[PDB]
Write a protein that binds this ligand. Sequence first.
Ligand SMILES: C[S@@+](CC[C@H](N)C(=O)[O-])C[C@H]1O[C@@H](n2cnc3c(N)ncnc32)[C@H](O)[C@@H]1O
Length: 226
Amino acid sequence: GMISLNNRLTTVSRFLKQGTIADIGSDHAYLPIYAIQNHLCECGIAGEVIQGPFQAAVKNVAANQLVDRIDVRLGDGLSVIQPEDVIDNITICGMGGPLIAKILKDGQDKLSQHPRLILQSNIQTENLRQTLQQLNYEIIDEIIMEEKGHIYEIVVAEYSTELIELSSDELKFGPKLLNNKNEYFIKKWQRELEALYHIKSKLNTEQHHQRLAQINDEIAVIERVL
Ligand SMILES: C[S@@+](CC[C@H](N)C(=O)[O-])C[C@H]1O[C@@H](n2cnc3c(N)ncnc32)[C@H](O)[C@@H]1O
C-alpha cells in the first residue's frame, strides 16, 4: 500500500495469520496499517498506554483512510482487549523481554481464544520465554536479526493443551535460536560476554559477592554455549 516499515517490524509482519491483529504499544499504528494495506490482516486494534501515542495512532489511521478497519484504544497492555474481540494475532514489539512478560502475565485472562503471539524483544528475552511457558504457550519460530547495529529477537508462539517445559539454556538463548546459531546470535552473546566482563572491571570482589556470583555464572553459561 503506502506505509514503509523497518526490517524489524516487516519481519514480525511475515508471521501474521489472516484475520485480526492486536498490536500492543503500537508504533503509531504503523504495523496494523501496513498489515491491512498489504492484505496480511483485514482488521486491527492498536493499543496505546499514553495520550501522545494514542492521538498519533488515531491521526495516522485517519490519514490512511482505515478508521473503519483499525480501532485505536487507550489502556495498559492487554487491558485494551475487550470480550467481544476476535483476535488472530497479538503483536508486542520494541520492548524489553521483562515488560512483554509482565504484559502477558498480568493480562493472561485476555488470551482465552488462544491467539498467535508475535513478540519482538529488545533485551533479556529469557523473562518472556519463562512467562510463555507458564501460559501454556509453545515457541514455534524465532528470528534473531540486526538493524542500525542493534540485535533484536522475534519469538512466535502458539497455545498448547499441555505446558511445554524449556531448559535453562532454551529459556535464555531460545529453543529455535540455539539450534541455528547464526552470525547475529554469536554477535549478541559475544557482546553480552564483553558487557559482563566490563562490569567485573567496576566491582570490587571483596564488596559484591552476590552480584559477582550471578555475573560469573552467566559468563560460564555463555562461554559453554558459544
Ligand atoms: C519503544 S516503543 C515500541 C513501538 C512499536 N511497538 C515498535 O515496535 O516499534 C514502546 C511503545 O509502547 C508503549 N508502551 C509502554 N508500556 C506499555 C504498556 N504497558 N502497555 C501498552 N503500551 C505500552 C509506549 O508508550 C510506546 O508507545
